[PDB]
Design a protein around this nucleic acid. Sequence first.
DNA 1: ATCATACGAG
DNA 2: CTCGTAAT
Length: 427
Amino acid sequence: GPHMATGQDRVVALVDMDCFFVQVEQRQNPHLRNKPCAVVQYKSWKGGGIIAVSYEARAFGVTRSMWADDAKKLCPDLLLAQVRESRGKANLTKYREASVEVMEIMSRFAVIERASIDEAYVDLTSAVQERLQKLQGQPISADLLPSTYIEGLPQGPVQKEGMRKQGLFQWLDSLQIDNLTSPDLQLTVGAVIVEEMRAAIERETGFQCSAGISHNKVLAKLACGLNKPNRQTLVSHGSVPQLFSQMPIRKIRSLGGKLGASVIEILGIEYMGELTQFTESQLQSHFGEKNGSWLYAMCRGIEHDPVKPRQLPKTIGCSKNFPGKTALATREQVQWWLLQLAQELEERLTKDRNDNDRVATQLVVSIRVQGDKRLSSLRRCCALTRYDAHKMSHDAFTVIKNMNTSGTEWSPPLTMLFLCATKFSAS
DNA sequence: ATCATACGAG
DNA sequence: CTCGTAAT
Ligand SMILES: Nc1nc2c(ncn2[C@H]2C[C@H](O)[C@@H](COP(=O)(O)NP(=O)(O)OP(=O)(O)O)O2)c(=O)[nH]1
Ligand SMILES: [Mg+2]
Ligand SMILES: [Mg+2]
């Protein structure tokens, strides 16, 4: 009881932009606002692949990884914004710059770990303690949480907003505002700060976002998706047993692939909560020492992964696929594309160095050969001593000359090219 | 025929 | 080091 850790030591939030790429295009082109719309890359093949979908468009069934032509069938009036193309490939610069706008605002409030182009984890433990000291023992008004949902409430003895208020009222009524060490109280204050954060992001960028507040990253991330869009959700330690009782295992971060599938099949279970019935050693025996320990604690709502203080991406890369009959087959083609990638990379690296006082020191070159099922067929690295596209492209070629078979021909033909800058050091 | 863009195991 | 897995 007393010596049992409950994983209520920190206050962690996850802020994720709503239909991010769409909002970026909607801010730029007002004609797209408040309409069914999506972001697509590469129109020629089947209308292009959809990578972002507005909530209005989702109502029609449009989704990610869908061909625009097919989406148009579900939603005839679907509006489409195209990803920029430069040097023969998709260019995501607009989205990276928009992401920076958001990350910089969040970093004002606390240490953040950039988890993706549109979301970041926030460690609000220190901020809440400071906020708690201020306005000590004074009741927290519901007005301070206009967009917050308390998971699992209301409970006990017909409109969604009405439902939200009810739950919120039960939560606040129950709170013990006098004990500054109360974990629930701490989450509540964290929620207040996140309201502030989200208001700042929308006021200063025009972008709306959702957020999750909890004691760790997995629960915060999970909480965030519960009430999107434009809403934030508080998931307390106490709400975990009921929340996890019907939560499919694949919903938890890092359990959506093979590992999650193995848990389900080896253990013969479907929901996260069903994991509590196994001993740590049992879980370790099936999924390894690290995975077993993590599952044992996670199914109980406990996780110790820290919010890493990293606002910038660790790598800068450029990659292009060349499907089916379009696979690269000549020396001239390979070199041309390597140069295109090398040029985009060079501009991206030069800007990075000027903005972030760092320089990449290693260049990674990856390819795929036709007939290979894997994402990558081969990976090779070389020094990156100069930010020059011509040198990097030539170095890259040198590095992959070995795969080619004789004949100016290239074979087997290449289905993918990838250049990635890595191993940054201060500059 | 989606594509383009961190981390642990060995 | 390269590779496989994973999320967005
Ligand atoms: N190329 C590509 N880009 C993607 C993919 N998935 C996501 N993105 C890009 C495009 C996305 O807009 C952005 C954010 O990823 P989310 O947060 O997963 N989705 P969103 O923010 O759109 O909606 P909401 O969060 O409200 O559900 O990342 C993909 O599979 N491929
Ligand atoms: Mg998002
Ligand atoms: Mg996201």
